[PDB]
Amino acid sequence: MLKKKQLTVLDLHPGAGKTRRVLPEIVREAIKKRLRTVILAPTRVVAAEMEEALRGLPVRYMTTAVNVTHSGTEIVDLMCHATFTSRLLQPIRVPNYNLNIMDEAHFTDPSSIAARGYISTRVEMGEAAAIFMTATPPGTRDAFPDSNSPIMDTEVEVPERAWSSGFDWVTDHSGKTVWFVPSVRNGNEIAACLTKAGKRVIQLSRKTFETEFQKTKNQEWDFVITTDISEMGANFKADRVIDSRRCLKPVILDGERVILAGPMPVTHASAAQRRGRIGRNPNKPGDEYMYGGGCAETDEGHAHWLEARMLLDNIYLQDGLIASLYRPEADKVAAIEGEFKLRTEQRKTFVELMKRGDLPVWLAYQVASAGITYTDRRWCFDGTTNNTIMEDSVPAEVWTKYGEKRVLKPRWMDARVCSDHAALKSFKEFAAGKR
Ligand SMILES: [N]C1=N([C]C(=O)[N]C2=[C][C]=C(F)[C]=[C]2)[C]=[C]S1
Numbered sequence: 001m002l003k004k005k006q007l008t009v010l011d012l013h014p015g016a017g018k019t020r021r022v023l024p025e026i027v028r029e030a031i032k033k034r035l036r037t038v039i040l041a042p043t044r045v046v047a048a049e050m051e052e053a054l055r056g057l058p059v060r061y062m063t064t065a066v067n068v069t070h071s072g073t074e075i076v077d078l079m080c081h082a083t084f085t086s087r088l089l090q091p092i093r094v095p096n097y098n099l100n101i102m103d104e105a106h107f108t109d110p111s112s113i114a115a116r117g118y119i120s121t122r123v124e125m126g127e128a129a130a131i132f133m134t135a136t137p138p139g140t141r142d143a144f145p146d147s148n149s150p151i152m153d154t155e156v157e158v159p160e161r162a163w164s165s166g167f168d169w170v171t172d173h174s175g176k177t178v179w180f181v182p183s184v185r186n187g188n189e190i191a192a193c194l195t196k197a198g199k200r201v202i203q204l205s206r207k208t209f210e211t212e213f214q215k216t217k218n219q220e221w222d223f224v225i226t227t228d229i230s231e232m233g234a235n236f237k238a239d240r241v242i243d244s245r246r247c248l249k250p251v252i253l254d255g256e257r258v259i260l261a262g263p264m265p266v267t268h269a270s271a272a273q274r275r276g277r278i279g280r281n282p283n284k285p286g287d288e289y290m291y292g293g294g295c296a297e298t299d300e301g302h303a304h305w306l307e308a309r310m311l312l313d314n315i316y317l318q319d320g321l322i323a324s325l326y327r328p329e330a331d332k333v334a335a336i337e338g339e340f341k342l343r344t345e346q347r348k349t350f351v352e353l354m355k356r357g358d359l360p361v362w363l364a365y366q367v368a369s370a371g372i373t374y375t376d377r378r379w380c381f382d383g384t385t386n387n388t389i390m391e392d393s394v395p396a397e398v399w400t401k402y403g404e405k406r407v408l409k410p411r412w413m414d415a416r417v418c419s420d421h422a423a424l425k426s427f428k429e430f431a432a433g434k435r
Contacts, residue, residue, distance in 0.1 A: 001026070002035060002099055005126040007119075009105075010133045013146035014276030018133045019046075019103060019233070020053045026101065026131065027057055027076055035098040035129075039078040040115060042104040042232040044210050047080060049233070050103070054078075065210070085111035088118060088315045089351050098128055104233045105132035106269050108299060110361050113308035113329065118315060121323035135276060136269035138328040143271035143295050147279030151289050158244050158292030160186055160263070162193035169290075171197050175239030178224045180231075180274045182246040182263035184420040187225040199223055204230055207422055228266070231273035235280070238287070243274045245293035250303035250360075250416060257387075258303055258362055258414040265296035305333035307361035313340035314347050342368060349374050357430055363414040370411075377401065379411040380431035387413040391424060401433030 001008050012018050023039070030037045041047040044065035051059075051066045060074035062083060077095075079087075081102070087094050100119040105112075122128040135145060144153060159167050160182070171194070181187040184205045191201045202215050204226035216224060216236060224236060228247055246263035247270065253259055266274070271291070278287035299305070305325070312323045322337050324330065342350055352374045353364035372379055381400070389396040389408040396408040396418075408431055410417075417427040429435060 001131065002029060002033060002129055004098070004129055005123060007123045007130045007132070009137050010131055011135060011137055014135045014273065015148045015280035016135075016146075018135075019050065023050070023101070023103065023133070024053055024057065027054060027059070030099050031058065031076060034075065036095055037076040037099040037101065038084065038095075038097040039076065040081050040084055040100070040102045041078065042081055042107045042112065043229070043234075044080065045213050046104065046233045047078060049235070050078060081107060081109070081115050082111040085114045085118075085311060085315075086351075086355065089311065089347075090355075096122075096127070100128060100130040101133070102130070103133045105134040106136045106138070106273065107232055108302070108304055110304045110307035110311060113305060113325065114311035114315070116326040116329070117308065117312050118317070118323045120326040121317065124324075125318075136272050138269070138326070140269050140272065143268040144275065145272050147276070148282045149279050149285040149287065151275065151279035151287055153275075153289050153291070156290045156292065158242055158290065159190065159193075160244055160246070160292075162189050170242065171199070173240060176221065176224075176237065177240045177242055178226065178230065178236050178238045178277050179242040179244075181225055181227060181244055183248050183260075184227060184422070186244075186263070187227065191223075191225045194223055194225075201225060204234075205420075228270060228274075230277065231270055234277075236277055238278055239284075240288040240290070241275060241278045243271065243289065243291045245271060245291050245295065247298065248419075249298050250362075251301065252303050252306060252362060257412065258360070258416065260415040260419055262298075264298050265294055267297055267299055268295045271295050299329075299332050302332065303362055305329065306335060307365075309333060309335045309337070310340040310350075310361050310365045313338055314342055314350065340365060340369075346371065356435060358426060358435075359430070360414050360416045363412055363417065366412040375433065377431055377433050381406045381409055383409045383411040383413065385409070387411070389413075389418050389424070389427075391418075396424065396428065398428045398432045400431075 047063045047065050058074040059076045059078050060070050061068055062079040119130050123130045191203050194201050199222040201223045202221050204212050206229045247266045248260040248262045250258050251261045275289045317323050346368045350364050350368035353359045387409050400406050418424040
């Protein structure tokens with residue numbers, strides 16, 4: 001496993017003990033063999049759970065989610081998938097790790113796909129070893145894998161809007177339910193319907209994840225309404241999962257705009273991870289999984305794989321060489337390796353637009369490749385009339401850094417900057433030059 005030139009996929013079923021049992025054994029062996037090691041966590045929540053499982057082992061936590069005093073003698077580093085990809089992109093020196101361990105290696109965010117591509121390329125070159133830990137590796141076709149205890153699987157119509165009748169089974173339940181919705185806006189509507197019926201609801205999404213997840217431990221709740229982010233190792237002490245089996249898919253149209261297509265079916269990997277939140281306790285057989293549609297390979301042509309190539313084309317590997325995507329997920333995009341490689345100054349703009357600007361990868365690339373500098377926000381206002389961003393069915397307006405009231409009409413339209421109130425508020429602040 002730990003020998004150079006080897007990539008191992010640790011594919012034990014969900015709840016089999018990959019993080020709490022297998023991971024500390026691997027880390028202990030890596031420290032014994034003097035292997036400079038990196039452990040990659042999908043989120044800050046998982047990074048905190050990993051510290052608990054690794055307590056007593058000398059690990060340098062490169063995240064503010066863990067409060068530890070490092071001795072300076074650790075040869076194992078732990079950081080989030082995004083942090084690893086970010087440090088590779090920035091001028092900062094990243095050690096050439098002998099062993100690369102990725103937990104929740106099924107994560108399909110652009111920085112996670114790019115991290116897999118880089119690490120797998122290093123292993124292919126015979127320079128390093130890697131271990132990818134996931135119950136659902138890329139290409140998996142089984143939405144119903146093994147579990148610690150039997151699960152009641154039921155195909156049923158699941159609401160995606162508020163309802164007045166026809167779904168008594170949803171509210172008649174007396175336990176705790178984790179409900180996967182296709183979007184933040186869809187979750188808001190269902191959460192309001194359940195709150196009106198007397199239920200205590202917590203909502204989770206990528207932007208509110210660390211703060212709102214704490215509420216699942218600190219208070220009594222009846223429902224957790226979440227997007228696909230809870231597929232990445234978040235654990236709940238729940239009795240039931242309700243799964244719409246739907247997700248939004250960012251799609252690049254004619255290479256000039258990004259729309260959020262769907263809702264459409266999730267992959268089998270996503271369905272298995274959603275179901276995998278329950279059936280984890282061998283002492284409580286009969287947790288329920290209610291599912292509202294079929295699976296499909298909706299990752300083919302998904303913007304995230306093209307965005308992963310934009311990231312990889314701008315990471316130094318060796319001379320003019322470029323890291324390829326991890327082989328089982330390479331056909332998800334039709335791209336030319338190196339097509340997105342930027343010159344030094346435009347690359348710095350690209351990185352700053354993502355890191356400080358908080359823009360999606362595709363949108364950051366359009367701005368940087370056009371030769372626009374980070375602080376120049378004229379492009380947020382000079383697009384075509386069809387790129388007008390709407391807020392409450394009326395064009396969104398902002399006061400520019402010059403003091404002029406203008407309609408938000410970006411030269412490149414990426415639907416992710418206005419998919420919910422929180423995203424549109426952050427994009428308005430960016431267009432106004434507030435960051
Ligand atoms: N899962 C769930 N539930 C059911 C149960 O647990 N059951 C049992 C136990 C034990 C035994 F021995 C037998 C059975 C409820 C709620 S959640």
